[PDB]
């Protein structure tokens, strides 16, 4: 009875003075906007209906029309930024925040959903949702002794909308807002539903992507151990955001990185660095490169966990992006590691996998590899075994590579190559 209407019919019903006719027309609009194939969002917008839907959102006496217009506006705001802007310009933000207090959970859920869609457009609409005062009523919906008493979908949508209020940068979410939200995020990170856990890890990942003060807000809440626990989950949808959050925390201070080491993260990296997913391997090797860029006690923690062989394996076979992050890890290890540690590197078999990558077209990776070779040679001088290193590099096909790199279009490549080809070869 409300299926396959026309925008003309929907408009004729919404512009009647019959609340039941308007309810029928708004339901027909919801069903139109609920279709997977080309929902006529732009036709509905041009018809001038968003204002009437927003006005229906305030009809507490007809909760059904509230719910239907909430659903309709949710799906309009789910689209392009211009469409979400139509929704916002109609005055829907304050109305949805008012609906967050509805006695009907199917209506407050839709208000949560619509505000999540609005805040997900970008930082400006996120901050406008926060200025209209959404965080207090949103977190109030989660103020329960046990979260398991709520409904799966309700909690999932609340967690999602909360993660979208932590999302986007330039600017990053307001600090007072992050402080208000984090406590509830920790609870949700300790929930049992994998969807809630995945969106909570995504939220933490957003909050940790920035200056070390943000990383510190998060780390000071004691979440690293739980993120490392979820890093070993069997559901990749949870492992990906968790690995991203841990890798972001490793971009800050050495003390913050130590928090990750102390939590046990390194014991999971044998599997992450052999993971069938290319992006898991890339993220894990990048995080390793930022750990090898830290203190020598942390490089020693890497060594102790048997992860140097896994980095050798990644430089031997992986996506070129993962191989490049591995090369960066090696260069950082050799730049700030002890001599003994560099000798361990060479004893694990780094030379040949590193030299077979001096045939790549990317210039940066060549620079990184050559800097690492230089570091290893310098470490060999302190031991007086640069001839052994030279024989090694020459017996895997390396000297040919460096010699040819002299004749490389780049300049830094040529000069580095030549200094190596002279001081040692």
């Amino acid at each position: 009875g409300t299926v396959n209407w026309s925008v003309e019919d929907i408009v004729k019903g919404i512009n009647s003075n019959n609340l039941e006719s308007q309810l029928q027309a708004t339901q027909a609009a919801r069903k139109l906007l609920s279709r997977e194939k080309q929902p006529p969002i732009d036709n509905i917008i041009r018809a001038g209906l968003i204002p009437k839907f927003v006005s229906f959102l305030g009809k507490t006496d007809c909760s059904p029309i509230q719910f239907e217009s909430a659903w309709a506006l949710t799906n309009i705001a789910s689209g392009t930024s211009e469409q979400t802007k139509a929704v916002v310009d109609g005055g829907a933000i304050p109305a949805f925040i008012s609906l967050l207090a509805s006695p009907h959970a199917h209506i407050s859920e839709q208000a949560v959903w619509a505000l999540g869609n609005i805040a997900g457009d970008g930082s400006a609409f996120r901050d406008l949702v926060i200025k209209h005062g959404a965080i207090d009523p949103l977190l109030a919906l989660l103020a329960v002794p046990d979260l398991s008493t709520l409904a799966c979908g309700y909690l999932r949508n609340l967690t999602w909308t909360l993660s979208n209020l932590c999302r986007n940068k330039n600017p990053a979410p307001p600090l007072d807002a992050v402080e208000q939200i984090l406590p509830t995020l920790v609870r949700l990170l300790h929930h049992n539903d994998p969807e809630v856990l995945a969106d909570s890890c995504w939220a933490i990942s957003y909050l940790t992507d920035g200056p070390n003060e943000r990383i510190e807000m998060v780390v000071k809440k004691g979440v690293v151990p739980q993120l490392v626990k979820l890093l070993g989950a069997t559901e990749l949808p949870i492992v990906t955001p968790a690995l991203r959050a841990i890798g972001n925390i490793v971009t800050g201070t050495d003390e913050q990185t130590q928090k990750v080491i102390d939590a046990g993260a390194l014991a999971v990296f044998p599997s992450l660095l052999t993971n069938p997913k290319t992006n898991i391997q890339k993220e894990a090797t990048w995080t390793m490169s930022n750990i090898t860029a830290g203190r020598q006690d942390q490089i020693q923690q890497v060594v102790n966990h048997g992860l140097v062989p896994f980095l050798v394996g990644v430089l031997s076979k992986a996506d070129f992006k993962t191989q490049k992050e591995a090369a960066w890890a090696i260069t950082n290890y050799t730049s700030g590691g002890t001599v003994e540690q560099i000798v361990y590197l060479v004893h694990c078999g780094i030379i040949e996998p590193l030299m077979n990558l001096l045939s790549a077209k990317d210039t940066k990776i060549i620079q990184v590899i050559l800097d690492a070779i230089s570091n290893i040679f310098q470490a060999a001088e302190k031991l007086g075994e640069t001839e052994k290193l030279s024989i090694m590099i020459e017996e895997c096909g390396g000297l040919d590579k460096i010699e040819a790199l002299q004749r490389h279009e780049n300049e830094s490549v040529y000069k580095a190559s030549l200094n190596l080809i002279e001081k040692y070869f």
Binding site: N290, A293, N332
Partner: peptide
């Protein structure tokens, strides 16, 4: 020796 981003 240099912590880098993605």
């Amino acid at each position: 020796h240099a912590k880098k981003p993605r």
